[model samples]
Target: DLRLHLLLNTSVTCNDGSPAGYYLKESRGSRRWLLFLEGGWYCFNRENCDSRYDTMRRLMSSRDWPRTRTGTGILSSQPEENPYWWNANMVFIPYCSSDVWSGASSKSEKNEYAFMGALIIQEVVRELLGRGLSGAKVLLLAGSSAGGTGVLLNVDRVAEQLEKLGYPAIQVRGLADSGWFLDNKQYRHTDCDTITCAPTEAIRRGIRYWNGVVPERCRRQFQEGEEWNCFFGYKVYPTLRSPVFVVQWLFDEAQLTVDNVHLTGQPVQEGLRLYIQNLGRELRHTLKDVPASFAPACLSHEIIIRSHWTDVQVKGTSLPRALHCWDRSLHPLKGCPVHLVDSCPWPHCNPSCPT
Candidate 1:
């Protein structure tokens, strides 16, 4: 049966102090669970957060959330469209903490809003234990963009937390969509302020502002001041204890934003085009050794949860196909090739890219 509406948990509230909630697409007695985290980027400091709250309030609070939210793409309930694991019980966790699911700070005089993203994830998992997640044989912790980065930041922590809860047998894995960002600077440099800070600089400020925490394994890799590097998917991916499958576009739209390449749906100049091509090259180089990934050379963002999810492909294997193959390679040892990356040097090289 389909889950009719949102389920609220008053104990875990959003940044604006509204109740935290999730949308569940219930599949009766399904032992497989796919929990997805909603993505809406993040805010670095209180000032930046305030600006975001004024504009994108839904991301920072649940006060205006809709009564019902139907699942799409990976979270779709329809079996024909979502061929693999369509009937698996799906849970959609909204982003409210403005911390990329890593912060643990609370509301205080200095900081007007709470940044309990890490806690929210834990709380939801705890709550799910009572709602049949305890019996889940496989738990796919999936997210896109910021949420995708969240998966990298929290997958191991979730696995360990579940172990402590006496559910060590529950296999928890991560599926990150468009979360792997290159720390490379923008082809065009920008000022070093909170709103316009570079990727690394922005995260550097955000970690302290949000009191963000990183996986211990990844944390220990860098020095005290440099540990913020873990916020990047490429940097943090190495230390994940649980297996993770990365789904990224070679020319990621969000990543381009950080690089200061604003898209206007028009043809760009030679330098900008080269910058775009270079972005694809870097993504390809970074994802080379990842055990399971689908890196399509397309200029897009967050497709795993979109209706056109199955439209994109890499090396002739569609995302749904790659994901299914990745799951099988892990569970039954088929060792099927799920690392289907596009070798194209330029954007829009793949005809399968979303049009």
Candidate 2:
């Protein structure tokens, strides 16, 4: 049964000050633990926050999210579907804070709105450690979209938590899916002029509204006003302690939608295609040292949720096979590797993907 447990602790809560919770399903023969974080885009301004609050206020409380679905990838119950993790103890952490699970409580506004994602994760990890998760042979920390960004940002802290808890023997690995959106600072305002809403302006608004949310290491690296740059994966990847498997689309549809680039016209589409190609290059540079990755040139956002979870391939290697190759060292309790998957060739190997 996918039973949801409320973290009654005062410090653990969603953005609306409602209770936070997680779903845990124990496996019969496995001590491996997989924690999957749900994804929802962030809301920085009061207008956006209020709009999100209207629909998600109830979800902040576990009682309201009664119908939880479990299937595919880390959540798959059948061994044939997800051989590695199918028999492992799995935990699903819902996303209700809308801060990519990084902001602190002090970042709230005048309306008493809470941005306590970091605090929530801290509490959740504490609770899990208190359980038997600390004894796990291996732990797969994974998430999708915004949640993927959260895992990338917090992997170090989570690893620290495990280390402090005296679990030096446990192997930790990360998987981030479709969450590698570039920081606005990397692009010029003039370059993004074709979009209806300016990306740079969005970054500014996000930073202003989610003040005090960026990681300290990232914040310290940049000037005071440029804190939002830290929210991008590339900024935080270099500082991560655990090796991560980054799965992304070279032509990410979600990013295109956010940047207001569509197939409406050739010029706009070409510009966005070039921008996406550049983003893919930047991602390669950022995760050059990462253990593994499965970057395809598809016109999609999230991947792990679809029927393609098993057979989707890039250069003859399926997602499962890529992850399997990446997990070899982790599976045997070996330390993280320097190079797992050598390359993520795009159009050359992913011809079916949109051009």
Best candidate (score: TM-score): 1
**TM-score, structure 1 vs. true:** 0.94
Off by over 4 Å in 1: 1-11, 263-269, 332-336
Candidate 2 residue-wise lDDT, 1-355, digit = tens: 4668879696567766667878888775777888887887777677767777778765344546775556656587786677546777878888877777776764234745676677777777788876788678778888998888888877777777778878888777788888887653333334422234454466566556554465557767886888667667777777666888888776576666665545555454555557656766765666665557777656677876554477566666677666766767544333423233325433334544433
| Clash pairs for candidate 1 | none
Tens-digit per-residue lDDT, 172-244, candidate 1:
9999988888888687886885746887888888888888999998888896878789988888898887999
Using Cα atoms with residue i matched to residue i, what is each candidate's TM-score against the true structure? 0.94, 0.83
User: What's model 1's overall lDDT?
Assistant: 0.84
